[PDB]
């Protein structure tokens, strides 16, 4: 199991073509 | 299991073509 | 298991073609 | 298991062609 | 297992062609 | 422009996890 | 422009994990 | 421009982990 | 420009870990 | 420009770890 606590994020993605993979600010234990 | 605590992130992705891999600010234990 | 604590990140990715690999600020125990 | 504590990172990737490998600020125990 | 403590990093990657290997600021116990 | 003429193909894909890239018998001028 | 003429292909892919790159029998002028 | 003529291919890929690069029978002028 | 003519190929890839580079039977003018 | 004519190839790759470079039967004018 897991926990994610206090966080601040402001990301921008301005021009993404064919993302088939991943663009992540914070990726915690994911799969993609 | 896991824990992620206090964090601040401001990333920008301005022009990404065919990301099939990954662009990550903070990747913690993920797969991709 | 794992823990990630206090962090500050401001990364920029301005022009990424075909990332099939990975561009990561902080990669902690991931796979890619 | 593992721990990552207080950190500050500001990286920039301005022009990346075909990264199939990895560009990482701090890589801690990852695979790539 | 492992620990990474207080760190500051500001790297820049301005023009990377076909990195299939790795460009890392701090690589701690990774694989690549 | 282009032309593809007489062809015979019998491919099998038995167990594909997370193909995010491509598995192609014959790839002629594509993108992926 | 281009032409591909008489061809026979029988490929098998039995166990592919995370192909993010490419597995191709015949790749003619593609990108990937 | 280009031409590919009479060809026979029977390749097998039995166990491919994380191909992020390429496994190709015949690669003619591609990118990867 | 280019031409590839009469060819026969039967390759096998039985266990490939993290090919990020390339495994090619016949590579003609490609990039990788 | 270039030409490749009559050829026969039967290669096997039985256990490849982290090829980041290249394993090629016949490499004609490629890059890698």
Curated annotation (Swiss-Prot), chains A, B, C, D, E, F, G, H, I, J:
It comes from the Eukaryota. Zn(2+) 2 binds at residues 2, 5-6. The record marks 25 as: Implicated in free radical propagation. Cu(2+) 2 binds at residues 2, 5-6. Glycans are attached at residue 2. Interacts with S100A9. This is Amyloid-beta protein 40. The chain holds residues 680 to 711 of 770 of the full protein.
